[PDB]
Amino acid sequence: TKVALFSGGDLTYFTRDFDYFVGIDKGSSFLLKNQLPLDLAIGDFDSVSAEEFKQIKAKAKKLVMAPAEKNDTDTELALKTIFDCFGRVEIIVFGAFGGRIDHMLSNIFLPSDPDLAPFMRCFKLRDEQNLVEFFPAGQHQIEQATDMVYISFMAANGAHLSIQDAKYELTEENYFQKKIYSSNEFKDKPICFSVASGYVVVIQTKD
Template sequence: MNINILAGGPEEFLPNLHEYSGENDIWVGVDRGVYSLINKNLTPVIGFGDFDSVSKEELQVIEGHVKEMKRYKPEKNETDMELALNWAITQEPVLIRIFGATGGRLDHLLANVHLLVKPVLEENPVNMVLIDNQNILSLKGPGSYKIEQRADKKYISFVPITLDVKGITLEGFKYPLENRHITIGSTLCISNELISDYGTFSFSEGILLVIRSND
């Protein structure tokens, strides 16, 4: 099972969500994202939020379509996205995709990126990606990973999330590296490209944000 979560970010940043709606996919709405899913004929199995970003009429539409609702007061310790993500992780899916989490407010964007850290620290981390119409983001802990060429996501960047990332090795890339140590704030690994059908990246310590992008 894959869980797709739609938040309430600007519509212009969304890819075609129907391309991610298969037999093994279920949808979860976060705040205004619940209403957006209904408008796209993608009914969420559950909705999360304080729903302060929808009108009374829109909330009535939501309540008429979604069987399970988790409603919260605006004054709370977690964002609506964190509450939805915590629920999704407990379902033990193969993959969690997050949409509608970029664009608009920068504090929400940064918070959503940092929410990807939590699963990385688990013994058996859930595979999670944050997707918009131009980027795919994921966080990786120490290890070795294969990465495949994608014509629609030519550029690949590796951004340190922890103070230090050690032992970075890039093979099959236009700009290869071997056992390099980079620190947070470094731009050494920005805007790389694969030179064959696939490449590998590995590192021994730290957490990396992997961003695949197009122009």
């Protein structure tokens, strides 16, 4: 019931404890190259040699060819596909960062897509020292994840945030403008945060 997507980012970190393995473009080649299952290879594969795509084309339990010129990114397309086949499943996206900033932002703001927003609570961005979760507009609580030390909140579409029970709080009584409030920490208690509309992007990090 646990799916794992190996994006085209830099997979210097990844886990193997997963039911289904999805590989976007280069991720497909990475998976194989690491003695790992390739249940699904998706994307336009414009980021892999014919030599590599030859091994993927004859090893992937399933392969999806996506148009070169489109609106959704291979990772976006991959997440949309899976949510259709499995429905509300738990996803972890590896290699969602690195290299290009435009692509990273695309992953950081995946929920911004109307079709993904509803499932924004089913997938996460993860790598060596970063963990990214997405919360719909409203009231929420969060407990610190293992390994991680710092935590930050950022509302896509500038809606005022509220943060309590954290080392640094953000009340309506001391609010100071900033897109992302980083370097915050827990303190033996769940952190409370909320947002009138949109959705919040929580980023737990370490090091």
